[PDB]
Design a protein around this ligand. Structure first.
Ligand code: CLA
Ligand code: CLA
Ligand code: CLA
Ligand code: CLA
Ligand code: CLA
Ligand code: CLA
Ligand code: CLA
Ligand code: CLA
Ligand code: CLA
Ligand code: LHG
Lengths: 742, 73, 74, 163, 161, 74, 90
């Protein structure tokens, strides 16, 4: 029966364990014999499963840690709003959003770093921000810095509230295991009460605050004399003169004459020509509809009033001849293992973030977002990287579950067992498809390189050569361009300006969006993307499926999840642990996301982003050379890496010099990672022995014996520095280039 | 590639591929004589070093000659 | 001229690495402490920790200060 | 207690395989059993002839429509000669494979037991002389198939959509 | 002059760089109102640059071809303020730090649980050790001459030969 | 610039020599592997025991010094 | 392997054909004043010229919709018939 269950005062609030560093584990609670202990102290701090076998205590730790993360995020958001309130030119940007660069960070005049306070416009000097917060606040109807201040104060209050909630739910009233295992109630509340009610509330804000303020802004009204939101809520005649349907006043809602709300609940599609963003009427209708859908969907599961679904009975009822018991035993897996839930949720969150990245540039939801090329590029790249990291983490935690939380006795002839039983076939076919994709994409690039170098441009794979047209994607674009005509008759515009139709939105003198063409280069780059994704999936899935055992080491589950090797026997067992598979999948996700963001940047600078003149001539940032230069690896090296890097390396002496500094520093960090990746551990241990001799000669040798990093730690440091260097190099390069050319 | 990924990944992958070849029709008729194994640890290090050095030498030689002969100056 | 210089410098570097590798192979396979008793080779083996530690110090000092000056100029 | 289509290899759960519709469907199994490679009772020479004929015939096309001289008037001849050269190289491959794998005078080590357990005779393709005959037949059939494809495509000029 | 370097007072490149930096700052300034805070910041920049260049000129720095001060580190008496004087200051500070760290290690090897003292620093002990670094060179020489600075090779772990 | 780059060259020479001499003088043995001479010149490792023994051979010192010589000649 | 993995009940295809003709051949009062099967028949009528694809004509969408519907109907009919002999829902 679904009920509230807590324990009073489980843990005493005391600083006694603060003085003891490794209190959470029996091994580290003894003391630091060696320096490795310190690293171990930071590598097992949040591994709550390793601290104890009690699932209740692990659940309580997880809940309180989530509260702490929420408090941290609240502090971060409050900081952003504070910096918008004081150290920003938000109001000047409101007065003129097309010619003033957003800025919300101001440096101190200490060591000549004051040069970084560039002339962003509006009588302000500071760092040009690319987070899109200005456009988000413009969409929300924020017109003054006082509103940002009150938002920041509320954010601090909420951070303190979350911090107190974590303390209360760990040390004062800690929920019991039965409370955490109520997955049906949790889903009902998070669907109806979290997503549905949140969407409804945001629709209310939009209807009452965003639409009137933003339509007055689109009309050219100076934000100073735009009436405040509460004046729209109170003086409803002032709101009705913008949208007459408000004069009806909730009568159409309850009489089901909903068409009378067509003034502010539209299904237009496309972009607002004035701002280049989505119509906020469409957004309000969207949020209302999804709120209704989520509130309906959150009434699906049976908590204690009958009427509903038992997910255990749903799962046990889904089985077939090609499988065994089907989805039998998965309810226990997902209600008794935190790592399985973390894997599922991480995979979904990463894929969702990638969807967000793809959908926020094709439909810019904020005003003056598309024409802010720097913000668009930054948002796309940021969310791509976040999604990739989350997917790799999902793989890691699936492997952790398979190693530690997997119980063969309760999993017999179900789906997990059967997947484990034909992993050889799965990995064989995935390896074959990876090889085939790698060949028929990168070998096509190499073919193009060779024929271009041999003076045989007619033997290449291009539009003026052997053509590989993406006919399926082109057909999908054609279908989506004609959707309002026949397939969605109640639509004014198509889903996005990227499908087709010959419509070009040009806020100011720039280009917001236009029909994106697909040719041989797009065919090639999408197949490169598919190749990289399949190879990453190969590495990660092979790590997960072979985590427990393999033909080499049949007892790999006893070895654990995070172990270096099993020895130099059987020819060498280096990197047989699933942790090492995640370690390599990080490199492959890095390559995949890097190529994805490079393709986005080049395609947008070449075919979409640009400036339109009064006559109507559209010139692009690069000049439309993607169709003929992206087909060749030399073209990528020259027309993208060499041509577009001219600004990061020439940024010295200007406000973009920090980008060049961090460009070179990220190069440095990557090269530094290379030695943790290439070197071993015995060499460094012996070098440390020599250094320890030098220290002992002078009676300055520490009692905490210096040790070289473990093998797994060496790999972790190498991959961390590698990813940091590469990603920061790209970050500096994109930001400098897109701030210079935009 | 040969310097970062070390041995075990490839040994397990080769196990899978041996299974695949032995179970594929019209191709299990063809049989190897030497059992395919992943490269050893020392051999992997040496092969990665050779690739690294060859790339170093060829890249720098190409750049040197092209930049000193494209502009005779 | 540029090609000749680069050629012979890379050849020299590889040759030096080979010389040191074969010194290591000599110590492993051909060095007899019985006949080499308290001679110069045995004395190098005796205070090898000092040699390695001073090489480490020289490398650390050079790297730190050269990299720091370069970063300062940057 | 359900139908459970999927079964272990010949009922043995400890052999590294499965019984899937892809593996042993009546249609798929019939198709694979009558391929020349799996006709163990037939002489290796004729199986090699059939295999080479099919392979040269299918190989002629890609070389003709993708070769460097595909835009010239010798496109057909160039493609046919490329296919013949590939056939010759694969003949050397087969010859060296037979030399390395099989020794003269040894019995065949091919599986002589059926799934039912009939215990038939071992296939002679896995022998030194069997593989030599197979290689010779494959060479002859490959050249014949290349010639036939060239004749149909160009000497006779039958109407084909893409060529 | 110490490797054909002219003094920066009569270096034309040094004055050219002065003029170029001031002109760039003034060009950045022209686009702001005189009373605005950015204008004040840029004017502070200009004053900072002017005083920096005057200070560099007044200390007899050696500028090469174009205007760039070059440092002489050969021990010349006219350039002791570039490397020898700050070098000695650095040596005093670095030796301070190392000496007090060594002293702390010595004073915590006699404790019952030295590792806990290394991960959790005894702040009073550490501070009264740090206070002793004022006269570190004298203590170092005393320990060297007395023989308490260097451990005998017979009590130091070494690997097999 | 010539000063800075010559000091970089000295750094490269000193570090490559450090790696190579450390490999040559620790080839016969060390605290981590006192019996390294019986295992030869080029052996993979001594297993994950005693904290891990990757690149503990002198051949691995040569392997690690080839990168530094390539960097220095570069 | 029992050689009848796909337990042959040939009435399944006919039942699915009937159950997919019935909903697809409906004069929907919506934007499609006529039925989608008539559009999927017109497409071939305009595409009977030998040696040529549709070339992004209004034929692919109807083809895909109709055949996805047919495939799902056939699959669900097979599952429904063969779940009664078993105890999947009984
Ligand atoms: C959480 C996200 C976040 C981030 C990344 C930043 C980042 C920044 N803030 Mg913001 N800020 C935030 C949240 C955030 N803030 C919130 C929530 C508030 C509301 C309280 C503020 C209020 C705020 C103000 C009012 C100011 C900043 C300023 C700054 C900048 C300088 C930081 C500083 O003064 O430290 C300086 C360093 C310290 C305070 C550390 C001192 C302690 C050390 C350990 C030494 C102690 C030695 C000894 C024991 C004594 C920096 C860009 C300043 C700025 O941009 O000026 C132009 C500024 O004036 N912030
Ligand atoms: C309508 C009811 C409701 C709502 C709104 C939420 C909302 C949330 N839950 Mg869920 N939860 C519910 C019912 C609900 N829960 C029930 C009934 C159970 C027991 C079966 C759980 C068990 C549960 C667990 C085990 C966890 C959550 C977590 C979370 C948070 C995830 C972070 C996020 O995206 O939030 C976005 C929104 C915000 C950050 C807004 C701030 C939060 C505001 C104040 C709403 C708080 C609603 C709260 C449930 C009301 C009771 C508190 C009240 C006494 C003051 C989120 C705030 C996770 C978490 O992060 O914990 C902290 C987590 O680990 N919940
Ligand atoms: C949770 C979201 C939310 C909230 C809190 C409100 C709150 C309010 N609405 Mg709004 N409204 C919302 C969503 C929301 N609305 C949505 C999604 C729609 C579109 C269907 C509307 C359409 C709407 C109309 C047409 C009117 C209101 C009005 C009102 C006010 C009086 C009605 C009431 O219950 O109080 C009140 C300020 C009335 C108002 O402004 O009276 C002063 C009014 O006439 N609302
Ligand atoms: C919802 C997200 C989420 C959550 C809750 C967890 C939770 C956990 N993970 Mg998982 N993980 C995630 C995402 C997540 N992870 C993602 C996205 C990845 C892919 C990278 C992984 C990959 C991963 C691996 C491979 C492992 C874990 C482990 C763990 C456990 C933590 C133990 C530990 O050592 O942490 C303590 C915290 C740290 C070690 C973090 C230190 C800081 C990191 C390494 C670098 C910071 C980079 C920084 C941004 C650089 C810039 C700043 C710098 C200049 C200062 C815990 C169960 C470990 C585990 O359970 O072992 C059994 C383990 O082995 N996770
Ligand atoms: C540019 C560097 C590079 C290249 C080319 C490769 C190539 C490959 N990697 Mg490696 N890898 C690299 C860097 C690289 N990797 C690095 C730095 C890492 C560290 C993270 C890895 C980690 C890694 C893992 C963990 C895995 C791979 C896998 C693969 C394979 C991809 C699929 C395949 O075989 O078909 C595509 C093959 C290529 C693209 C190679 C080039 C072939 C060209 C196109 C044709 C040239 C042939 C031509 C006729 C010349 C003939 C020569 C003849 C005359 C002698 C392939 C062997 C995966 C694998 O095993 O395959 C499924 C795998 O699991 N790699
Ligand atoms: C006078 C010169 C000289 C001589 C006589 C020797 C002789 C010897 N050396 Mg020494 N060596 C030399 C120079 C020399 N070396 C130099 C310059 C180096 C530094 C690079 C080394 C480094 C070295 C090491 C590290 C080792 C030896 C070993 C050996 C012995 C066995 C060599 C072996 O197995 O060969 C077989 C030859 C090879 C395996 C080389 C294969 C080809 C290499 C990898 C380069 C290929 C590059 C590339 C693929 C080709 C070009 C491609 C193109 C596309 C660009 C032998 C006594 C070994 C030994 O004594 O074992 C205990 C040993 O471990 N040598
Ligand atoms: C750019 C890449 C890079 C860098 C900087 C280094 C740096 C170093 N290596 Mg490594 N190495 C590399 C690549 C690199 N290596 C590669 C690719 C290989 C081939 C596998 C090796 C192989 C190798 C071996 C085999 C050996 C070294 C050694 C050394 C040291 C030489 C002495 C020196 O320069 O001291 C100066 C130190 C540095 C330049 C390190 C960086 C110092 C930073 C900039 C200062 C800290 C900044 C800041 C406070 C940190 C912020 C982080 C956080 C707190 C926020 C030094 C630590 C030798 C050694 O350790 O001898 C003592 C040695 O034996 N390396
Ligand atoms: C370095 C040696 C070398 C030489 C001399 C050649 C020579 C040639 N190559 Mg190249 N090739 C090489 C290495 C070499 N290749 C390598 C290493 C690769 C892998 C990267 C390739 C990949 C490659 C491709 C992908 C293609 C060529 C093609 C060609 C042919 C050019 C087109 C032509 O002649 O007209 C058209 C060709 C003909 C009119 C006649 C070709 C057929 C004759 C009869 C071949 C001889 C067969 C003979 C029975 C066996 C002799 C060899 C045997 C002893 C091993 C030409 C014969 C093209 C070609 O036509 O392929 C057949 C082509 O498409 N080559
Ligand atoms: C038009 C398509 C269609 C649909 C939606 C259904 C749906 C259903 N059929 Mg019917 N059936 C169909 C065609 C269809 N059938 C045809 C063509 C035949 C051949 C005559 C049958 C013969 C048949 C028999 C004999 C039986 C069923 C049964 C069922 C139920 C079992 C669950 C199921 O199949 O998954 C449907 C899945 C969902 C509703 C949820 C997911 C929806 C999508 C896929 C997501 C379900 C209500 C069985 C039943 O329940 O008996 C009462 C049963 O005994 N059907
Ligand atoms: C060609 C293979 C087409 C498989 C089309 C397909 O989706 O088959 C679906 C097939 C049917 O199983 P059932 O769906 O009847 O099993 C009931 C499920 O609800 C239990 O999860 O599932 C499998 O046999 C495992 C996956 C097949 C192997 C996938 C390889 C690709």
């Amino acid at each position: 029966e679904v009920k509230i269950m807590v324990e009073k005062d489980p843990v005493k609030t005391s600083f006694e364990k603060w003085a003891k560093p490794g209190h959470f584990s029996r091994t580290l609670a003894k003391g630091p014999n060696t320096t490795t202990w310190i690293w171990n102290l930071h590598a097992d701090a949040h591994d709550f499963d390793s601290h104890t076998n009690d699932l209740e205590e692990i659940s309580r730790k997880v809940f309180s840690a989530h509260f702490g993360q929420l408090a941290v995020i609240f502090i971060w958001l409050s900081g952003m709003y504070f910096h918008g309130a004081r150290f920003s030119n938000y109001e000047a940007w409101l007065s003129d959003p097309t010619h003033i660069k957003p800025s919300a960070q101001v440096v101190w005049p200490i060591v000549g770093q004051k040069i970084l306070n560039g002339d962003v416009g509006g009588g302000f000097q500071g760092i040009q921000i690319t987070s899109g917060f200005f456009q988000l606040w413009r969409a929300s109807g924020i017109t003054s810095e006082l509103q940002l201040y009150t938002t920041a104060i509320g954010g601090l209050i909420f951070a303190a509230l979350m911090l107190f909630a974590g303390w209360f739910h760990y040390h004062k009233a800690a929920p019991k295991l039965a409370w955490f295992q109520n997955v049906e109630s949790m889903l009902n509340h998070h669907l109806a009460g979290l997503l549905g009610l949140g969407s409804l509330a945001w629709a209310g804000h939009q209807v009452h605050v965003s639409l009137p303020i933003n339509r007055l802004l689109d009309a050219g009204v100076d934000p100073k004399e735009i009436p405040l939101p509460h004046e729209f809520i109170l003086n409803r005649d002032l709101l009705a003169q913008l949208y007459p349907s408000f004069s009806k006043g909730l009568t159409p809602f309850f009489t089901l004459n909903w068409s009378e709300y067509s003034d502010f609940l539209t299904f237009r599609g496309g972009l607002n020509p004035v701002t280049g963003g989505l119509w906020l009427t469409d957004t309000a209708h969207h949020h209302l509809a999804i709120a209704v859908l989520f509130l309906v969907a959150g009434h699906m599961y049976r908590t204690n009033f009958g009427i509903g679904h038992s997910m255990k009975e749903i799962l046990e009822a889904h089985k077939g001849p090609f499988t065994g018991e089907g989805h039998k035993g998965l309810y226990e897996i997902l209600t008794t293992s935190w790592h399985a839930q973390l894997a599922i949720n991480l995979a979904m969150l990463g894929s969702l973030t990638i969807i967000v990245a793809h959908h926020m540039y094709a439909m810019p939801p904020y005003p003056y977002l598309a024409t802010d090329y720097a913000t668009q590029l930054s948002l796309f790249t940021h969310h791509m990287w976040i999604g990739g990291f989350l997917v790799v983490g999902a793989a890691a935690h699936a492997a952790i579950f398979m190693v530690r939380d997997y119980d063969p006795t309760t999993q017999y002839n179900n789906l997990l067992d059967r997947v484990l039983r034909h992993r050889d076939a799965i990995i064989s076919h995935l390896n074959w498809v990876c090889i085939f994709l790698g060949f028929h994409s990168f070998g096509l690039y190499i073919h193009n390189d060779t024929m271009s170098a041999l003076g045989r441009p007619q033997d290449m794979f291009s539009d003026t050569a052997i053509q590989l047209q993406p006919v399926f994607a082109q057909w999908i674009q054609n279908t989506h361009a004609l959707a309002p005509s026949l397939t969605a008759p109640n639509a004014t515009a198509s889903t996005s300006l990227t499908w087709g139709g010959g419509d070009l939105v040009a806020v100011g003198g720039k280009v917001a969006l236009l029909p994106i063409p697909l040719g041989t280069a797009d065919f090639l780059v999408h197949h490169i993307h598919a190749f990289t994704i399949h190879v990453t999936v190969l590495i990660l899935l092979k790590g997960v499926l072979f985590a427990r055992s393999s033909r080499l080491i049949p007892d790999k589950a006893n070895l654990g999840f995070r172990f270096p090797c099993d020895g130099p026997g059987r020819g060498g067992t280096c990197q047989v642990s699933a942790w090492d598979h995640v370690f390599l999948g990080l490199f492959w996700m890095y390559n995949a996301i890097s190529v994805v963001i490079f393709h986005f940047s080049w395609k947008m600078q070449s075919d979409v982003w640009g400036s339109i003149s009064d006559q109507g001539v559209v010139t692009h940032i690069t000049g439309g050379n993607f169709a003929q230069s992206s087909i060749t690896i030399n073209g990528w090296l020259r027309d993208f890496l060499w041509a577009q890097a001219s600004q990061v390396i020439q940024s010295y002496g200007s406000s973009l010099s920090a980008y060049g500094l961090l460009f070179l520093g990220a190069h440095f960090v990557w090269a530094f990672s290379l030695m943790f990746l290439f070197s071993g551990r015995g060499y460094w241990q012996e070098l440390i022995e020599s250094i320890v001799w030098a220290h002992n000669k002078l009676k300055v040798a520490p009692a905490i014996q210096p040790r070289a990093l473990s093998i797994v730690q060496g790999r972790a440091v190498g991959v961390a520095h590698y990813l940091l260097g590469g990603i920061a190099t790209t970050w500096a390069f994109f930001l400098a280039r897109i701030i210079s050319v935009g | 590639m040969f310097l970062i990924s070390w041995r075990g990944y490839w040994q397990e992958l080769i196990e899978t591929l041996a299974w695949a070849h032995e179970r594929t029709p019209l191709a299990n008729l063809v049989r190897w004589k030497d059992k395919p194994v992943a490269l050893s640890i020392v051999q992997a290090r040496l092969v990665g070093l050779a690739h690294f050095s060859v790339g170093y030498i060829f890249t720098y030689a190409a750049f040197l000659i092209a930049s000193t002969s494209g502009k005779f100056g | 001229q540029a090609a000749l210089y680069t050629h012979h410098q890379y050849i020299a570097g590889f040759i030096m690495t080979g010389a040191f590798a074969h010194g290591a192979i000599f110590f492993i396979r051909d060095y007899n402490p019985e006949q080499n008793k308290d001679n110069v080779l045995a004395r190098m083996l005796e205070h090898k920790e000092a040699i390695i530690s001073h090489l480490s110090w020289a490398s650390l000092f050079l790297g730190f200060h050269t990299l720091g000056l370069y970063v300062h100029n940057d | 207690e359900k139908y459970q289509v999927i079964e272990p290899l010949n009922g043995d759960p400890f052999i590294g395989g499965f019984e899937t519709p892809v593996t042993s469907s009546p249609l798929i199994a019939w198709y694979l059993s009558n391929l020349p490679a799996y006709r163990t009772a037939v002489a290796p020479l004729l199986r090699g002839v059939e295999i080479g004929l099919a392979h040269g015939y299918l190989l002629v096309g890609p070389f003709v429509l993708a070769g460097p001289l595909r835009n010239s008037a010798v496109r057909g001849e160039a493609g046919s000669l490329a296919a013949a050269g590939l056939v010759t190289i694969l003949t050397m491959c087969l010859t060296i494979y037979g030399i390395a794998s099989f020794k003269e005078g040894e019995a065949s080590k091919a599986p002589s037991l059926t799934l039912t357990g009939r215990q038939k005779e071992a296939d002679k393709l896995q022998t030194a002389e069997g593989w030599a005959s197979f290689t010779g037949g494959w060479f002859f059939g490959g050249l014949s198939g290349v010639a036939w494809a060239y004749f149909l495509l160009y000497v006779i000029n039958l109407p084909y959509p893409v060529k | 002059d110490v490797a054909g370097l002219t003094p920066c007072k009569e270096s034309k490149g040094f004055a050219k760089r002065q003029k170029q930096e001031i002109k760039k700052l003034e060009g950045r300034l022209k686009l702001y109102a005189p009373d605005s805070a950015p204008a004040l910041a840029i004017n502070a920049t200009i004053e900072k640059t002017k005083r920096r260049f005057e200070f560099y000129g007044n200390q007899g720095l050696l500028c090469g071809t174009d205007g760039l001060p070059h440092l002489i580190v050969d021990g010349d008496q006219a350039h002791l303020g570039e490397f020898v004087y700050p070098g000695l200051v650095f040596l005093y500070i670095a030796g301070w730090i190392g000496w007090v760290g060594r002293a702390y290690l010595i004073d915590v090897r006699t404790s019952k649980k030295p590792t806990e003292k290394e991960i959790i620093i005894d702040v009073p002990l550490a501070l009264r050790i740090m206070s002793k670094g004022l006269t570190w060179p004298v203590a170092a020489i005393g320990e060297l001459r007395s023989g308490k600075l260097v451990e005998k090779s017979s009590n130091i772990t070494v690997s097999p030969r | 610039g010539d000063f800075l780059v010559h000091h970089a060259i000295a750094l490269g020479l000193h570090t490559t020599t450090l790696i190579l001499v450390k490999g040559a003088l620790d080839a016969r043995g060390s605290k981590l592997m006192p019996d390294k001479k019986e295992f030869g010149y080029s052996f993979p490792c001594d297993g994950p025991g005693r904290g891990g023994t990757c690149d503990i051979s002198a051949w691995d010192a040569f392997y690690l010094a080839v990168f530094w010589m390539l960097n220095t000649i570069g | 392997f029992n050689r009848d993995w796909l337990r042959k009940d040939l009435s399944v295809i006919g039942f699915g054909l009937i159950g997919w003709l019935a909903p697809s051949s409906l004069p929907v009062i919506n934007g499609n004043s006529l039925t989608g099967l008539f559009l999927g028949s017109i497409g071939p009528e305009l595409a009977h010229f030998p040696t040529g694809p549709a070339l992004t004509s209004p034929f692919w969408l109807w083809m895909i919709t109709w055949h996805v519907g047919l495939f799902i109907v056939l699959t669900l009919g097979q599952i429904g018939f063969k779940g009664r002999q078993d105890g999947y829902w009984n």
